[PDB]
Design a protein around this ligand. Structure first.
Ligand SMILES: OC[C@H]1O[C@H](OC[C@H]2O[C@H](O[C@]3(CO)O[C@H](CO)[C@@H](O)[C@@H]3O)[C@H](O)[C@@H](O)[C@@H]2O)[C@H](O)[C@@H](O)[C@H]1O
Ligand SMILES: OC[C@H]1O[C@H](OC[C@H]2O[C@H](O[C@]3(CO)O[C@H](CO)[C@@H](O)[C@@H]3O)[C@H](O)[C@@H](O)[C@@H]2O)[C@H](O)[C@@H](O)[C@H]1O
Ligand SMILES: OC[C@H]1O[C@H](OC[C@H]2O[C@H](O[C@]3(CO)O[C@H](CO)[C@@H](O)[C@@H]3O)[C@H](O)[C@@H](O)[C@@H]2O)[C@H](O)[C@@H](O)[C@H]1O
Ligand SMILES: [Ca+2]
Lengths: 152, 150
């Protein structure tokens, strides 16, 4: 009966996850990108569905993060997008102990190409690898260095 | 509801107040035991992001290192105590499956066995290994994990 609001910060670069174009209501299938700007159209919330699993929700639109096409077991390099649909293939967990975002089928959210310092507008993709450039922390919109609990 | 069982992953035993009371006294040891009942249900009261109080549901007492030191040494016994303060802050790491104190040590079965006998004490220890792993499960489905951050 309450969801915190937070920024998803790419730990190595200090950039954040955005809908591409920064819209308050991104069209379905809008890519999830990295970008350095901060504003309320890149705020997110986490809608808990089942223990660790839930929906990464764009605060302004209510659309949530999907592997493009909604496959349950997406291959490496599957693009992440926003979409209004809510179902089990858009379930992720926000690992705030190991600092990563993991999909229910076991791959992680990465910047495409795996750079520690990706350009603005770099796409995000699913990938099974674990390394410093797929780490993310979840921080206050009022203080981008203050971690906040996404599970309440 | 918001209650859960703290299950020792390797043995399937659970965290209990020693003696299984609904109203354990201050400084009652936290032990491992195979039984299940409402007097071994726990809750977690969030204080600051990941940090909070591990709470015995029936009594409201919370988990402390015995003596309440900020940086307790290895083998410090865990107990229940009504006091609230920052040396009783833990985080419930449901990704690595362990319970970590604010100063960085973890809750262990004393002696570190993957199959501790009933009534084995719990202690703080800085090492990480299979036998200090815990998962947090539904009272009505002892194999179903539940979210302790509420
Ligand atoms: O991408 C996340 C989305 O995946 C699934 O929906 C895919 C896509 O289907 C529809 O688009 C069409 C069908 O009209 O299918 C292809 C692309 O797959 C397009 O040529 C065409 O527009 C929907 O209209 C799209 O919005 C949708 O993204 C899945 O069904 C969704 O739940 C969601 O997971
Ligand atoms: O996208 C996330 C993924 O990025 C990195 O892997 C990218 C890509 O690297 C390799 O492809 C090539 C092989 O020639 O290696 C360079 C590095 O990008 C590319 O120019 C070229 O396409 C792998 O063979 C691909 O499978 C891989 O997807 C990073 O290494 C991954 O850990 C991950 O972060
Ligand atoms: O164990 C957790 C508890 O540790 C600290 O309290 C220690 C101890 O204090 C009182 O015990 C006695 C006897 O009444 O009082 C002195 C210290 O004031 C101790 O040497 C002696 O044992 C309490 O009656 C005990 O319950 C308590 O264990 C800390 O102060 C507490 O906040 C709590 O963290
Ligand atoms: Ca749950």
């Amino acid at each position: 009966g309450h969801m915190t609001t937070f920024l998803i910060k790419h730990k190595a670069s200090g950039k954040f996850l955005h809908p591409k174009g920064g819209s308050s209501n991104p069209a379905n299938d809008t890519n999830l990108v990295l970008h350095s700007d901060i504003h309320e159209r890149m705020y997110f919330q986490f809608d808990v569905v089942d223990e660790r699993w839930g929906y990464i929700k764009h605060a302004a639109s209510g659309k949530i993060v999907h592997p493009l096409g909604g496959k349950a077991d997406p291959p490496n390099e599957t693009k992440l997008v926003l979409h209004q649909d809510r179902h089990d293939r858009a379930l992720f967990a926000m690992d705030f102990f190991n600092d990563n975002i993991i999909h229910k089928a076991g791959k992680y959210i990465h910047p495409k190409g795996g750079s520690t310092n990706p350009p603005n507008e770099t796409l995000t993709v699913m990938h099974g690898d674990k390394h410093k450039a797929m780490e993310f922390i979840f921080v206050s919109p009022k203080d981008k260095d203050k971690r906040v609990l996404v599970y309440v």
